[PDB]
């Protein structure tokens, strides 16, 4: 019933939802990133930046990566 003493692991952080229940939500660390502009994902969708691609990777697509820098065609 609280975020205290709850370890979500790497890439996740605990957060209380609208029901006062602690949940592990995707909170990827993006400090290691080099290119800071938009990136084209292996799903063919552009992401405003890699940080966002990592969030989506963690939330829905495990095999998602950057297939090239810049916007997708």
Enumerate domains of the chain plus CATH numbers.
Answer: 1-73 (3.30.60.30)
Q: Is 61 exposed, middle or buried (0-12, 13-18, 19+ CB in 10 A)?
A: middle
CB 39 within 8 A of CB 69: yes
Q: Is the dihedral of CA 18, 24, 26, 32 positive or negative?
A: positive
Q: What kind of experiment solved this structure?
A: X-ray
Q: What is the resolution of this structure in A?
A: 2.5
**Rounded Cα–Cα distance for residues 25 and 46 (Å):** 23
* DSSP assigned state of 39: E
């Amino acid at each position: 019933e609280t975020c205290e003493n709850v370890d979500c692991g790497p890439g996740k952080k605990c957060r209380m939802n609208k029901k006062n229940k602690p949940r592990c939500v995707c909170a990827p660390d993006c400090s290691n990133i080099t290119w800071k502009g938009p990136v084209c994902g292996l799903d063919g969708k552009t992401y405003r930046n890699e940080c966002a691609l990592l969030k989506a990777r963690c939330k829905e697509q495990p095999e998602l990566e950057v297939q090239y820098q810049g916007k997708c065609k």
